[PDB]
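Why this split exists: single-chain examples teach little about how molecules sit against one another. For that reason, every record in the complexes split bundles all components of an assembly together and asks for one structure covering all of them. Below is a record exactly as it appears in the raw files.
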Amino acid sequence: AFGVGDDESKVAKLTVMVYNGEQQEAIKSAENATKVEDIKCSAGQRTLVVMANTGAMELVGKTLAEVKALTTELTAENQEAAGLIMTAEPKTIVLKAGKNYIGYSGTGEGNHIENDPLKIKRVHARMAFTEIKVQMSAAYDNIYTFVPEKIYGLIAKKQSNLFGATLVNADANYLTGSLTTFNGAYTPANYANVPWLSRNYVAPAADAPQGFYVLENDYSANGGTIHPTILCVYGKLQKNGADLAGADLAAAQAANWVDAEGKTYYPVLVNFNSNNYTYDSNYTPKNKIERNHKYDIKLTITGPGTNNPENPITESAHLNVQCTVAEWVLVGQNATW
Amino acid sequence: AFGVGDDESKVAKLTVMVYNGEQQEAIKSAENATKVEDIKCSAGQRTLVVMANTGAMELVGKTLAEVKALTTELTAENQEAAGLIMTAEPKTIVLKAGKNYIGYSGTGEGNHIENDPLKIKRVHARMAFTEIKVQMSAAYDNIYTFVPEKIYGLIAKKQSNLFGATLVNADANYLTGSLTTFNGAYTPANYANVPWLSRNYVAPAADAPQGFYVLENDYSANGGTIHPTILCVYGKLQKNGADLAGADLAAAQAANWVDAEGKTYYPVLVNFNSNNYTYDSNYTPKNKIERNHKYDIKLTITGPGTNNPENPITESAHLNVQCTVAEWVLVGQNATW
Amino acid sequence: AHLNVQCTVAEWVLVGQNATW
Amino acid sequence: AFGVGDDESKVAKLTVMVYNGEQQEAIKSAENATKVEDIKCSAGQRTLVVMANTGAMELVGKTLAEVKALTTELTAENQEAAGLIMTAEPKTIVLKAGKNYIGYSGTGEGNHIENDPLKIKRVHARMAFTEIKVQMSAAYDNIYTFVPEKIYGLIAKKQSNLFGATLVNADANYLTGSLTTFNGAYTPANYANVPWLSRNYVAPAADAPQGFYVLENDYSANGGTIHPTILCVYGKLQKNGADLAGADLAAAQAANWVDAEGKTYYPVLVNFNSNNYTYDSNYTPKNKIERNHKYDIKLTITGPGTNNPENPITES
């Protein structure tokens, strides 16, 4: 149940809280709907927060700053598209005496504060493949062939904030569906082999695309190390129809392609702005990942893969040649008999 | 004797007197019965007045002009239903010379003058609690708990008239059984502490209530300032079982909830026509307090109270929120490797 | 001329007030 | 088309490939031109190789250690200037991510690899006659008279390498444009006849020469036995105007001039440093056939010739 569009937008527990300034005054949560009916409170200047799909969390009696600094982390139950926490910003509305309501402009008595319906954005981020097609270059045609096995994502962050402009917090506790043993320049600090982020390869396309849900991350720096949330493919690499064994594992390992079993990796740094990547619809790429974005990618397989998929990517270029023919050398050997 | 049915309607002295125009003619008082025997007087056009349960107060010598402007002030002895001043209206009767009386038509000889027995209102007005049940809301359930100590009422007036159409005059000498230091909007000038209106908390039910006897006051003017008579409950407020201290005691007082010790107020001000109160038997609320009325009130405790009970009250308000979900921001990325 | 007056007493009116906070 | 300068130097196929150590990274070939314009690869440390006129030769997939040991042979196509392999040594360039070009430097954007256009050497060599004028000595004036018939060459080598410095390898499969009947001090063991190294004699001059393309072969040892490359003419030897027969031919066999048919040879050694030869433009001669050289020879007949052209020569 990864991605249908219906389950991506489905509230299950809407919760509205009204404060009078740093103190909990009114709170009443409704379930499996989107209309709230009886939030009784005082009048005057109040602050209005609204959350959805929060699950079983302590929310009674908590103050303003504690609900503004709540943290969630992704579970096993997020990859089946459930428990997607949503959020609007605080907006400090004002209230009249009799009966106030917001949105659905011009229905009954009382008074309307805001005419348009209130918007709530998500907090997750979907990344997925769409196309996986192979096209070997001139230097490997009908020699090396690829078959895919696993599709696991690599450097997914653990936890993030829930309210504000950006969503970052200094808790580097990233999660990984790989061995977490090899270590490139995209350095593993303190990982965890977690059996969620690992799916078997079944039919990637434009309908039901295989992928994962990750939280907000930032790697838009210029110097120092970064931790890009890459997404990779993994599987066996065959040589002219047969499996790689015997007298070619040692030949391949010096070129840094294939692991000791016969497998190889294929990483894609989603939203990274390198020379291998292009973008459609006039999108200048920013070097982070932000909430409410459908990062779907189409890659092309040219040549074999690589070991150590957290190594830095190699950028492409082009060449062209022009040469001249040399001159002869004369001697002129005159002989006599 | 705070009201049994007999200790509050029992005449201790029924003074009755006559007038032939601007000067007295006769007076004779009888005790512990509703009758008088041997008034003697002339015949012709007269004017009859009758007061009851006056007690120690001079009433001889004065004229018709001075008796229509007598003022009484409530004393400390009026809390055991002793000293309830009961009076009537002048009724300009004529008088035949032989023998005539007023009351009990169909008993003796002579001629009756008024057929029904003459009726007498009082001037006081009782206000009392009946049910102080507590039901915390959802936002403070199993967090705050309330226990009452004191019951005192605050802005009762001091003196009034005794005859005429209305009974309220122009005077400001108010009384209060509280700490009376703080100022608010409903705060008149020159009123000080009096230690009569203060009691313990003794199990208030539909039988044997707790309250006071207060006089008349008008606060029906729309603009400007007003001074209504309020009644309050004052008590401790324990946060999660133990005594209130710690980080909350400097946090609750910013919300204007609890005073500088750990105690909370609960005011309710009689006959106001606000959003906060309901009534019954289809009784419209006037904005005053009149004679011969009993005010039994029934509050519930929802949440904490506020300090400074002479502030204007905050009208309640309901709410309805409808929220919609924003859509994805679809980015596209094609990749080469 | 003489006089006898025999008065009665009048009961209150009940005004109930259901309040909330 | 033996020597025009147009057909002698014309790239009928270019082929450019580039490695990253022991594996193939990129490969592309243009045709009938000298420009491959769209090489796509990665960046980093690479090694560049470029070949010309390889023909139908398998170059995809093969590693660097196998490319650096390729061989070739001379063909019948090689004697009319068609199928001349042309290569250069690897030169380990380093690439940049933007755009890199080699040749026509200083004209476009990006950066330059190197300034000059790249040079490609041929692998073959040429040996050819240019002037076969005949002036007999005093002891044969108006007695013997020579006329030529054939032009073939003798001890060309079959195979070689394609990369290195001295691209001669240890093998022995030599070719010959004549008989295997005489066995002098020059004839090697494995030996063969190949009937394309032989034209028929026509009018050599300052232009329109006659000769053969050839590969490279080392015979510079002092002691032991060598195998030098010999070119020759081969023709009748008349006596006093008529054809030679009678009881003089059996008197001519004892001096080993003329064989049983009536003909004689004229062997000449290319680049030999003997007393009988001479040179010009102050050139010391080396005892090997090296790459990309043009050996024009003009000889003067003085006296008759000899049998056994694979015998050692007798200096003056």
